[PDB]
Design a protein around this ligand. Sequence first.
Ligand SMILES: NCCC(O)(P(=O)(O)O)P(=O)(O)O
Ligand SMILES: NCCC(O)(P(=O)(O)O)P(=O)(O)O
Ligand SMILES: [Mg+2]
Ligand SMILES: [Mg+2]
Ligand SMILES: [Mg+2]
Ligand SMILES: [Mg+2]
Ligand SMILES: [Mg+2]
Ligand SMILES: [Mg+2]
Lengths: 339, 339
Amino acid sequence: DVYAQEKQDFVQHFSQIVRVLTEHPEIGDAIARLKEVLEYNTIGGKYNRGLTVVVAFRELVEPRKQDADSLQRAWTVGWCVELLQAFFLVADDIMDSSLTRRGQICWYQKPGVGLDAINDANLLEACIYRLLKLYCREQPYYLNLIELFLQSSYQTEIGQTLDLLTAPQGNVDLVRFTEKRYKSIVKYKTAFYSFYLPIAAAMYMAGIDGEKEHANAKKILLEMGEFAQIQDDYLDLFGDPSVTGKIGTDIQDNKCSWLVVQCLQRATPEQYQILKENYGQKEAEKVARVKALYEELDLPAVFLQYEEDSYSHIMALIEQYAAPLPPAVFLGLARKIYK
Amino acid sequence: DVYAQEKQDFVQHFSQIVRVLTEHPEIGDAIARLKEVLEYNTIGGKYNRGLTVVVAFRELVEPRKQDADSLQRAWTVGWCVELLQAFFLVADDIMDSSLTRRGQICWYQKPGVGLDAINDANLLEACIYRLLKLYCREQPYYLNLIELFLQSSYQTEIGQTLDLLTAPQGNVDLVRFTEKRYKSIVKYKTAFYSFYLPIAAAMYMAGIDGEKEHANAKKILLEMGEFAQIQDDYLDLFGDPSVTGKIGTDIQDNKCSWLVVQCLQRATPEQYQILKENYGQKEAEKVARVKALYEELDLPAVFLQYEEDSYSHIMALIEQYAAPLPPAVFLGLARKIYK
Ligand SMILES: NCCC(O)(P(=O)(O)O)P(=O)(O)O
Ligand SMILES: NCCC(O)(P(=O)(O)O)P(=O)(O)O
Ligand SMILES: [Mg+2]
Ligand SMILES: [Mg+2]
Ligand SMILES: [Mg+2]
Ligand SMILES: [Mg+2]
Ligand SMILES: [Mg+2]
Ligand SMILES: [Mg+2]
């Protein structure tokens, strides 16, 4: 695996990122806190979004053009994608009332952190533009990268607004949980930043700035993003937290999950009433009742059939839109998403 | 007053900003929520930071160069400074546990908003870069403006970290409340975004990009920022909430206020013990005890003498560093700050 090898080399570069971001004695205490925020929240994941930048860069740039400075800028932009994700996740954990992430308690759940995590999240986002300035300022793709990260943040935030508006706390929202609504939330809240952003960053760094090539890449990557969020929704309830590193909250949070959308399409009038009575509530027995209904409607089997259909669809889109990019750019990512 | 006239003309342009930011039917609901966030949080203030952009622009640019498009870009950048402030304040109200702002309950205290305000704050920040792209993309100062707003956000966030680290909830922190600590917090948390950012934005728009001229402007503006935060700290306890539009929380939040720093410099060993026992706690009787101690040490009189000394100092800095900029750029702002 092209990711599995480059993984340890990627993590080894974190130490330099922290040193450069921690490099005015008056702000000493604030800088020591930023280092703590970085070390707790940006390290511990699979680093698939950040590694995608590095792997795509090595596949798109001519090896004679892959000098020490060029590769350093590639790893740094990969770490900017990981920082963007860390910004979103620190805040998403507060708004989703989550307990754990990447095998440890959520940063905001830590004694002595609490709602100060809001500012900590904003500092993580600020660090992206600090790194882009320090390493890419004199490059011709500088403005393209800045605008890509800003645009990806706007899209994600619009997606999170849709996610939160469809999931009001204390209100029965089954009418809102439609396939059309689900597809819009997922496109904006995760597909852009998770798949389009790292490949587009590598494309701009390789000097591929054409509107058509970015549109063709986006066509594959947004569909891959849709499947990744469906899988994330499935694992929220049916995944092993020792593997996922987090505890699911979608049922309690009244979320427009892929699971609830599939339930509503297959439920009898009686089964709809069970869902209405038990969904979007904090009671453990009500959550268990929803999971029992999902297993009764064979939703894990419906998911298994969907993964197969989605995989074939994404492969047909790679055949249609990959050119002139090497298909291996999209196949490597598809190998990581589909298990 | 050059601000008092241009105030109504500034507010009249908000309608266009909202229309352009609310201009894909799938994200309809999210866009309707963004409009609600903008209308609740960006309108209702004095608009002094946003007006500073417009007034400084008209004073720095030749009237023959002040065309309809140029002025439209000036009002828009003024509204970007107001959006940046709205982003910081929506989040600062959550972390300071505030109740009201600009005469109404804090956005997060609204029933049905709560911690979703975290995402709402992030959308306000995203809107800045949406407006810069839509109006300033083809201008030579585009990258300078983007970098100025990003740098101002980083500085402010570093300042807020320092503010929160010096004010731990549940801990007696009087040792930390020094003049040197206070001056660092204030420089970063408010002075850059409140005074340096709007003048620098107008300077870049007028084609004044020289390192020396920006350094000379900053020398005046950061000192003005220091006084504005001291006045804000004084009004937190001794101001009229019908005038300030907000309720003070500095004593309850264990903040390193200018007032507590002055108290600690003038307190007898007995008075220090009263402060230690009553500061940084939510009990109304303990807050009242701290205010009684402040009035006993004549801190409102100490503030009155400070405003006079600060005013003379800022005027001496205008005489020293204003040139070649018209002194009226700094005098107009000084007239607004000093009451
Ligand atoms: N997309 C952000 C984070 C998530 O994927 P996560 O499962 O919390 O990591 P969400 O389900 O809240 O959308
Ligand atoms: N500077 C941000 C907001 C304040 O000025 P405000 O008094 O809450 O408006 P703070 O005192 O929290 O610093
Ligand atoms: Mg979540
Ligand atoms: Mg979420
Ligand atoms: Mg999830
Ligand atoms: Mg405050
Ligand atoms: Mg504050
Ligand atoms: Mg205050």
